[PDB]
Write a protein that binds this ligand. Structure first.
Ligand code: CA
Ligand code: CA
Ligand code: CA
Ligand code: CA
Ligand code: CA
Length: 319
């Protein structure tokens, strides 16, 4: 399990009954949107799985397929998202970010840099089973240059696992290499960075990055913005953020999605769904710490409707 996320497993749970009340809410005219939301966002994900089981074995029509028709707009996006299992959701968002070589580079980057070894493996599996083709191929297909190399590497999900002894020598050797390969040099040995940052264990890389500051006048992030540019730079930046502080990373991503004119709902929804039973609690705390007001608050301000309520239940608290 994971004790660090909002939207905990609903106690008292009755799958059979819930599926009834959802039908009811659908069967109603205008849809009791309100109920559907009030239910599905206060149930854990597996709980939703046996509700879709129960709703199919009680009507002979698949719940997701039913709600697609029952709903519209960003609310649909949300709920439809929640019904998928974690791996399926990730897989689907991934595929949809590549639908054409007019790819949505940003969304790809996010899911890849943030997702862990286990998560990644399960995704690769589900992706192949879902779309009859390898995720690695689809990545290669829609990316180019160094960027491709990076994303592939990352998506293999073969990060060295958390070695339980601390390699103080290596940490130094790596930091050095990153410096030598980047800032110290004219131009940049990109494949080194890709190598070190993809392969090493995360708690190793955290320490590498803090050591790096002993050789370089700019921290790892600043070094990235200087030494490289483009979609590669964007990736590196995201990656580093995920290693140093992932809750914070997601917090910032959430902020950017609302701060300005209108809203980047595609991102906001994805994050709220995906991280609801993972690190949402840590995210909210980091967010509040940095931005002064709650996440709840920005979400409240930037979105409205039944939809807004869904998002709040997913945030799951006021802070
Ligand atoms: Ca209505
Ligand atoms: Ca629809
Ligand atoms: Ca594009
Ligand atoms: Ca340089
Ligand atoms: Ca806004």
């Amino acid at each position: 399990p994971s004790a660090y996320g909002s939207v905990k497993a609903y106690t008292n749970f009755d799958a059979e009954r819930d599926a009834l009340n959802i039908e009811t809410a659908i069967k109603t005219k205008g849809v009791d949107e309100v109920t559907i939301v009030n239910i599905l966002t206060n149930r854990s994900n597996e709980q939703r799985q046996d509700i879709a089981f129960a709703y199919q074995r009680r009507t002979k029509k698949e719940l997701a397929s039913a709600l697609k028709s029952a709903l519209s707009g960003h609310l649909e996006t949300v709920i439809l998202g929640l019904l998928k299992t974690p791996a399926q959701y990730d897989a689907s968002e991934l595929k949809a970010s590549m639908k054409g070589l007019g790819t949505d580079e940003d969304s790809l980057i996010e899911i890849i840099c943030s997702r862990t070894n286990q998560e990644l493996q399960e995704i690769n599996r589900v992706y192949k089973e879902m779309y009859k083709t390898d995720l690695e191929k689809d990545i290669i297909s829609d990316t180019s240059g160094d960027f491709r190399k990076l994303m592939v590497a990352l998506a293999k999900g073969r990060r060295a696992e958390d070695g339980s002894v601390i390699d103080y020598e290596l940490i130094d050797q790596d930091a050095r290499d990153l410096y030598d390969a980047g800032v110290k040099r004219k131009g940049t040995d990109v494949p080194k960075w890709i190598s070190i940052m993809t392969e090493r264990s995360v708690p190793h890389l955290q320490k590498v990055f803090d050591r790096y500051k002993s050789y370089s006048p700019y921290d790892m992030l600043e070094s990235i913005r200087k030494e490289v540019k483009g979609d590669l730079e964007n990736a590196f930046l995201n990656l580093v953020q995920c290693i140093q502080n992932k809750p914070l990373y997601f917090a910032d991503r959430l902020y950017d999605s609302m701060k300005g004119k209108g809203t980047r709902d595609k991102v906001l929804i994805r994050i709220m769904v995906s991280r609801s039973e993972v690190d949402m609690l840590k995210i909210r705390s980091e967010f509040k710490r940095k931005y002064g007001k709650s996440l709840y608050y920005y979400i409240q301000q930037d979105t409205k409707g039944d939809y807004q309520k869904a998002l709040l239940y997913l945030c799951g608290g006021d802070d």
